[PDB]
């Protein structure tokens, strides 16, 4: 019987009690990163994260930081491999920058052979240290040219351009890469990029944010979500029909959260909780497992929800070998109105739920996850048992999928100094508490989870936050980015992996 | 009789001897700037200078600086108007960022109304202080989307996109703007952008620079030059047929240089000097005055020189109301081989000339213009009489055009400290020595020159050099860019204007 803690103080930092041997022998342990966040713009074309962060610098982060140079993994990719080698990691999730290998977006316009060689060298270096690559084709960094030609994922033209890009990656790297991710966190771009305009490309309704250059927060999230599923399923079909000889697997990435009722004896809050599961996970998991959106979405969203043709439904249904599940936290849900006729209506209001970290009796769900200095009532809190609840739900609701945990981690403030930054005990507590529950859910519920990749390998540019928060297991000095030095967390993870 | 000095020391800094009253009463005096160099990326889409400086940071300048924030004329445009008001300037040359008003390049994709309002406010502010705007439509900052769709000026698709962009500018601002420039320095993009790859977009032959993403240095300069002339002439036709009611004038910008023989008794060097005039000025001035390229270019460049159809020849011939002439320096010319079959052949070798600042007897042409710290034998030297020689040549060879001097100025090192930077006596000597010759040529040769705009209003990002050189008449502190403080040069120019 496995007992895991839910509240501070935790004791899972002790490698005598929890380590890699607690898990099956073939289980993969590593870390993750993304191209915009770590490489720098040297050697690549421009993408919508470059566009968004330069056009709307106060949305890039409070320091106006961006990915122009960041930790310079373009130059220091060998140092990333060295961190992984130090950890004795068996996996590394990284993304390919579309704009580094096809700067002009559409593959018929030509490829950047030097950009292809950059990834060849990385992949070869990983494999030579025994590290299995998990490669994300699209981690939000769409070539700027495609957004300007047709508004990227807002248009169905994106399916064929994404397909041709994916084909080039499979042709070039698939002899060595056996685990591919298509689109990072399907829920994110639609909602933050086209609903709230917190993320690139920064579209939304005029009264939601007057700085959006265009958009409609009520309709566009649904259009983008739909084209994301079609483009993902087209690439999966391509992979499975034309690259089956490479012996690899492919899947989407979901951002996952667990949801609990704000008031667990109030039927209205209980209903809002179940609505949240459908609108946040089922929006994509319904199409991925059944080829249709959830009935509550069909009913509520009405004419604003696109339909799949029979051919598209068949293409999208079952379009995964595995699921990359990212997990960070859990929210309480209570009812909220859905004012569809308001000019500031957003797709996110369709779920009819208001999300908090404090329930109706004043209980905070768990330890502090992220402090919000502008508004402290907006602090985010974590909940280690949520990873257990998510995994169990995916096995039970979504046909017992093979799962890899593709992201899991916590930030510490960028205002801390080096020493404080290195002594990141809050990060050991977060990582170990979630690893305990993950082991518990694998053993108790038999969820087919086969790996775990913590967010992040090193400090990087954080979407929306600049360099004001740090997520790395390895520290990077922004005045001289060459080195990546294991933090207390990285050292702890090293001993968890090789106890 | 006017006597002007050619060698240090100069005495034209004395406003008793040379001032604005030395020139006709209607003569316009001011300063100039360009959008990429001063505004910052806030509020606009991305262009090829953003692309080039981020993809090839060591080509952006030795400090890797770029135009991301620069002096923040987006925020501080009122402070630029204040500098002009302090100078009692009567003209200001600025450029419109295509990417600020049409971020998606093609006008049918929509316009950025807030970007239009930015220029409305500037123009209105200038006119209210009695300053005549001279507005450059294209100062090299092509929306990145157009370079990625069809390689910008390499393709004839650029003509109609440039035309639609120009139309929008005339419609929006032409009721107030009466002097328009089409393309800044026609010789520059073809040669530096597509021949040497020193400038965006950074194309060239593989053995010229292995870092070019594509190109051909022998052919591409000619293609781009040709499309530049066609796009320029299309816009001029549009202006003169559809916006004649606005009562304004339009013209191209040429970079001008004078050329002297390396050895003035050697017929080979004399021939190389005359070749240089044709290949550097006649490349564009031949088409602009006659609808054909110079015969020496037709003969030497052969199949690599495009031909104008009769319709295109007619469109391009006479396509100017005035000429914007930029002038900085003069070179000696001697013969050099033209190895057309070499893989590193460039369009610039077609002239069969090698350019220096020192003649065959060891005479340096004039005072120091720019020091080159990597290689001192590469220092550039200036020649005040060259402005006289250029103006006289344009009147005599090119049908007595109306001319405005659209750029003239000198850099000082970015390594100097504030105090040294402010005491920019070398800049007063450069500006006054050229103004003396300009007055002399207007009086002696009756050249129809009606204004002079010194390069630059303030310190900015310098193409190819970052923030390592300063060209401003007003100082900007890079640790806090709000203020623009008149240097010794700006104060001298203030007294030259209002003695
Ligand atoms: C897994 O995919 C199955 C489809 O392959 C889902 O079953 C389908 O569910 C739909 C309803 O969503 C059933 O379609 C209904 O068919 C009747 C009967 O002929 C309809 O009137 C109803 O159409 C009306 O309601 C719609 C909203 O649902 C409106 O959009 C429409 O304008 C009408 O108001 C709907 O008919 C559809 O109408 C729109 C068409 O373009 C569409 O093709 C048409 O089918 C459908 O019969 C059913 N298919 C079968 C083979 O059973 C399945 O849905 C789950 O199971 C069914 C039994 C219902 O209980 C659903 O509520 C529940 O979601 C889904 N499973 C999951 C878990 O999502
Ligand atoms: C101002 O524009 C005038 C054109 O409106 C120029 O005059 C034209 O000059 C061209 C030569 O460049 C003369 O064309 C020649 O016509 C003969 C006679 O029929 C040709 O064989 C010669 O073609 C051959 O030489 C070419 C290189 O010049 C090659 O490309 C071609 O393959 C042949 O090798 C050329 O004929 C032209 O060939 C290419 C065709 O597609 C083209 O249309 C055809 O014309 C032309 O007759 C002449 N036009 C008239 C009305 O005079 C004028 O050129 C200047 O003046 C003329 C007299 C010559 O001295 C030129 O050397 C000199 O540049 C130009 N002025 C300026 C100052 O540039
Ligand atoms: C968890 O949700 C439950 C279920 O909603 C909350 O209990 C309900 O709380 C209501 C108070 O907000 C109770 O209703 C009231 O009852 C008093 C006593 O008779 C009456 O005077 C009030 O007018 C009110 O009655 C309602 O008026 C509106 C009508 O539309 C409606 O029909 C009436 O319900 C209600 O009885 C109670 N439900 C039951 C199942 O207990 C619970 O609220 C917390 O506990 C309740 C007992 C009460 O002490 C609340 O003060 C306290 O907030 C809520 N828990 C939390 C922690 O918010
Ligand atoms: C400015 O250009 C002029 C014209 O080219 C230079 O003068 C020429 O310089 C040549 C030396 O480079 C002279 O030719 C030589 O004459 C000596 C004396 O007879 C002879 O022994 C040499 O072999 C050579 O002769 C040539 O050999 C190559 C053959 O293909 C050719 O037919 C011969 O010309 C040449 O006489 C002279 N031209 C005349 C018009 O004076 C001038 O050079 C400078 O002045 C000349 C006088 C000489 O003192 C050079 O040392 C000195 O560089 C050059 N000016 C500069 C400053 O470079
Ligand atoms: C978002 O787009 C939707 C659909 O185009 C707009 O909602 C429609 O608004 C038109 C104009 O009132 C109405 O006649 C229809 O009833 C609406 N259709 C549906 C599907 O709701 C909505 O106004 C647009 N929002 C923004 C802010 O532009
Ligand atoms: C530049 O483009 C030109 C023309 O396409 C190339 O020169 C041609 O080269 C082909 C292959 O040798 C020759 O057969 C022709 O004689 C050339 N044409 C002319 C007009 O010169 C040149 O090789 C290309 N340069 C680069 C470096 O790719
Ligand atoms: C690993 O953790 C397990 C508890 O599940 C423990 O039994 C084992 O001894 C630990 N391994 C080491 C080497 O500490
Ligand atoms: C696969 O590749 C072949 C040949 O390149 C092509 O004919 C076929 O349509 C492709 N695709 C898919 C996704 O099946
Ligand atoms: C618009 O929405 C904001 C936040 O969603 C809300 O605070 C405000 O009350 C809404 N206004 C209207 C007119 O509904
Ligand atoms: C690496 O991990 C393998 C597998 O668990 C282990 O046998 C080996 O000793 C570890 N190496 C280090 C240096 O920890
Ligand atoms: C301006 O310069 C001219 C010389 O051309 C001189 O005669 C005149 O007095 C000067 N003006 C003033 C006010 O110094
Ligand atoms: C001018 O505008 C009119 C109407 O918009 C158009 O029909 C005509 O073709 C345009 N152009 C030029 C360059 O003449
Ligand atoms: C190539 O050109 C460079 C500079 O233009 C020159 O130094 C070199 O000698 C040339 N090589 C060949 C093979 O011509
Ligand atoms: C501005 O220039 C005009 C025209 O020469 C002049 O009359 C006026 O006094 C000048 N103002 C200042 C403050 O120098
Ligand atoms: C930040 O910038 C946008 C324009 O990019 C502007 O709408 C907004 O006022 C600014 N936000 C704040 C909070 O200052
Ligand atoms: C920066 O860090 C690297 C690795 O720690 C070091 O070797 C290099 O000398 C440092 N550069 C400077 C300028 O300090
Ligand atoms: C600078 O960068 C380019 C790649 O952008 C590379 O080809 C070249 O080696 C570098 N230049 C120097 C002088 O280091
Ligand atoms: C920077 O300069 C402006 C103008 O000189 C000044 O008013 C502002 O206070 C300064 N900001 C800082 C942080 O020094
Ligand atoms: O916010 C923490 C991380 O969450 C996950 C996103 F995929 C990654 O790009 C982001 O940095
Ligand atoms: O190099 C000095 C100046 O020369 C002129 C170019 F148009 C301008 O953009 C540049 O900064
Ligand atoms: Zn930047």
UniProtKB/Swiss-Prot annotation, chains A, B:
Its EC number is 3.2.1.147. Disulfide bonds join 4-436, 12-432, 204-212. Keywords: Disulfide bond, Glycoprotein, Glycosidase, Hydrolase, Metal-binding, Vacuole, Zinc. InterPro entries: Glyco_hydro_1, Glyco_hydro_1_AS, Glyco_hydro_1_N_CS, Glycoside_hydrolase_SF. GO terms for molecular function: beta-glucosidase activity; metal ion binding; thioglucosidase activity. Transmembrane segments: none annotated. Zn(2+) binds at residues 54, 68. One of its GO terms (cellular component) is vacuole. The active site is at 407 (nucleophile). L-ascorbate binds at residues 185, 257. Pfam families: Glyco_hydro_1. Substrate binds at residues 37, 139, 184, 328, 455, 462-463. Glycans are attached at residues 19, 58, 88, 216, 242, 263, 290, 341, 344, 359, 480. It catalyses: a thioglucoside + H2O = a sugar + a thiol. It is found in: Vacuole. One of its GO terms (biological process) is carbohydrate metabolic process. In vacuoles called myrosin grains of a certain class of cells, myrosin cells, distributed in the cotyledons and the axis of the embryo as well as in different organs of the growing plant. Its main location: other. PANTHER family: GLYCOSYL HYDROLASE, THIOGLUCOSIDASE. Belongs to the glycosyl hydrolase 1 family. It seems that the absence of a catalytic proton donor in plant myrosinases is not impairing the hydrolysis of glucosinolates. Degradation of glucosinolates (glucose residue linked by a thioglucoside bound to an amino acid derivative) to glucose, sulfate and any of the products: thiocyanates, isothiocyanates, nitriles, epithionitriles or oxazolidine-2-thiones. Homodimer. This is Myrosinase MA1. The lineage of its organism: Eukaryota, Viridiplantae, Streptophyta, Embryophyta, Tracheophyta.
